[model samples]
Target: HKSEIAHRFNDLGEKHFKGLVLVAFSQYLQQCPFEDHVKLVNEVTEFAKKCAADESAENCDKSLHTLFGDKLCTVATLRATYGELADCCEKQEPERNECFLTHKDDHPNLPKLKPEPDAQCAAFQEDPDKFLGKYLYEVARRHPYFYGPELLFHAEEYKADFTECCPADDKLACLIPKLDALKERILLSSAKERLKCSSFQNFGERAVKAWSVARLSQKFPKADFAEVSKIVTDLTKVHKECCHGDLLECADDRADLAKYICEHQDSISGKLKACCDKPLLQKSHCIAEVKEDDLPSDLPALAADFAEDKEICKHYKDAKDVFLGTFLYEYSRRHPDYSVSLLLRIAKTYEATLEKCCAEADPPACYRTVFDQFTPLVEEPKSLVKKNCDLFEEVGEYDFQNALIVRYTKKAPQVSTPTLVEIGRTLGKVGSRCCKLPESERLPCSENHLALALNRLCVLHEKTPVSEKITKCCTDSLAERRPCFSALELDEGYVPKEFKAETFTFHADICTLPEDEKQIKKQSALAELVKHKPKATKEQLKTVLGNFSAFVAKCCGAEDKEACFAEEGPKLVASSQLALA
Candidate 1:
């Protein structure tokens, strides 16, 4: 019979009943395998049936009231349990009654709830132990259920000391000392106690702030509470001045008070300021002991390197906002003739550039071109087109390719429209071929060969030919067109005679190296080509070498191959810059 009853109870358990039935089964299981165990099973079945009964709203409400009695009906208890009932308390009598009537059916099984008695009130005054214990228990309910016993224990440990200072007649005097003692107990006690203390229903923000500051002060033994408090209070002033024009935000919600003080450390001012100022050795060490793990790295020294302007330096004070500030300061330093209005405009331009170009596929390149455009607008907008072109070669192949458009755009203003078409044609060919290579090989192709070749062509833009062959050549297949550009790059001494007659005098800015220096330049370029081809397969290498040998034979193989290259290589290279045509 006992085994049969146990099996029946096990079957019932598996059904996973809820409400009062669950509670009854839990109680019964503790006394399981009991005398007349079959009687126990019958008892649980009756409890489950009662829980499963289809009670009307009226019956549910009556049962709930009967279970908790007066504890559920008190003004504080009623307000605490039902948010709607609390809201109703603020309404007129008729509406308040109607609100309760409307919500009564909805919250039929609402649990009985309670509140802490105000420390200065009659209930607390009558029996402080009972009052404090009830308050702690209620607060601890907000924490995990397992924390209840420890919370009750901590409450008892501090209650006598808490009650010692209450002068019966003076509520203000009675409340302050009790709160202060409990605060000390909370800080010194266990983590569970501290959490419950921090969450006490009526303690408010100031109390929580003070408690947090104390906990932090204790954690850092060297921290003087007086100095920490002063630091926090001063920061509150600056926060008000810069933020919402009042201390309302600073005042409430001080959940992370220590962190707030540390972050706003720069806002500390006057004699109170010396306490938190990290550099002044003679000032109070108490503030020095405070933790600042949350603060941003300083940029004051970087700002000082450029200008003494406080407004500008303020922007550079934190690493996160320093980009625009650093640019403005450097821009001002380079162009000292900057008017305030001009600087402001430059600042606005920088801001707008970041907004527009940050999302581009190549943001840095986009930024460079935009910066170049604005640079010329400044007093003596320096020439970076040539400088940026050279940068492609030095920054190496991949970055150079990525920055090619920027470099071209930088030099584009100096280039002729027909020349731009030729340069654009070359770029499209390079991008199509080089960018599609395996990821590892793509960058090397772009950076080492394509970018270097393209930049050289742009540099010699004024000398490049504007012939129909060159313009129409790009329309051919990639295989045929790529070699044509490569041929033009390699054999600068070999343009057709008619091509040279149209654009004879090279731009004066083009270098006029001695004949021997020109030969050395030609060989150095050949060596770069050789170095650039190391990764090519044997057959590809053969094709490249064969083409180069043929180029040398045609352009410099004349009886005066040396003389031919010397006089005409520079001319051909210079004239080949079809971009400037």
Candidate 2:
């Protein structure tokens, strides 16, 4: 009930007020709800009204003073109510007060007030022995997003040791320091620590227990073996006491594990001590299991998987195979000349080294042992050229050109033919340079040069078109033949093959048109190109139109211009930079 009151007060503080006055008033509201205490509620309500009206500062302070019975309400009773609001009892207040008085003089600011912790300090000094649970409850009350009902639900469901005031049931208290340590650890580290915080979970019960002891042992490395043993014993005893019984209904059969550990505490402590004497990985193994199933089978798939889960995997030594495998694959992919055998050799070296530690709790540490010992053997670039250059040469010239062009075009669909030709020129340069080299050296050397040039010219400039010099090479052909003369068969603004008509300028069947109609069609086609090519000067369009008209007069003005235009016009249009349609 006190826990609920503390939670409500915390919520009220956040939503309504954020100062000592608000906190103390919230307590008053809890003790004397307006429904049950009308007169007191009226006085309290009027005080809030005056405060809301922006009354004189002294007037508001005076009213708060009246309600709290002091300037800033530094009284211990107001503060004492803070922790007692948890599941602890008030009937034992006298004994709790005796304890508080013993420690009270130590705190110089006991009489000074803070918004939240003054109450907490009062309760803590009241009974340090029982304060942890109440403090945790208070923390949960105030910061529900992290230390909320979900954490409590897990603790309760797992029968985790959260009992009040017993050292043998102080797992919850022990966990608090570890979480704070982990929070600090994460704050100091990078994505690696972030993933550990997220994925290293046994639903917060078992994981916290293991990390608590494991991490704390690291903090006190010089602590005696017996001292560390005592810590483990105490944790075990507390876990056994608090984790067994009606208070917690054990799911996942945790009770059996608790019973087994409690019975063999001596053996576990001895093993853990030996473990701690070694590195962090071995020490973690003292408490964690490493089954053979955790070993990676498919190197490439494992590598790909780890690319996504590197942050999480970085936390556990057993999971580093994926990272190492991923590195190998990434390196190979970056350098295409690296043969499959070389990649396999590197992967095998990793596997051979890690296999020894695969069943160990910390297999990832074995990576360096294997990596350092295994020197990779790869076919030299010159040797590869002698054996493999002829392989690609068998591909026909047209097919080879198509393959190269398609490779770049798929990456940028809007890439024009001129861009393709420039890329071909780059390919030709590499081919020429490689061909001059000895056959044994050409394979690797040529591939390297080609890859480098393609990366710089095509891959990096995917979205940008090639230089205008190259772009202009296609402009004349594109202008005349792309949507070509056949496009003249359609009416202006026709939607059939929309892009074709968007540029279509020539009137219908130019050769079929009568003498007068032919003139009309020529004029119409010129007007369309003029309207569309806003960048083209009017003089340029006129000159281009004049050339086409002269060609038509010579070719189509006399005989069947449609037949002549159909047979010869395509080539004539192909030769000029004029954009008729």
* Top candidate when judged by TM-score against the true structure: 2
TM-score of each: 0.17, 0.20
In model 1, the runs with Cα more than 4 Å from the true position are 1-129, 136-164, 167-355, 359-581
lDDT of 2 by residue, 252-341 (tens): 122234344335444333333343444322333333321111112222443333223323334335656344434443444333343332
Q: Please, what are the lDDT tens digits per residue for candidate 1 over residues 380-408?
A: 21222234344544554333332332233
lDDT against the true structure, each candidate: 0.36, 0.36
Q: For residue 309, what is the lDDT in candidate 2?
A: 39
Q: RMSD to the native, candidate 1?
A: 34.7
**Per-residue lDDT for 501 in model 1?**
27
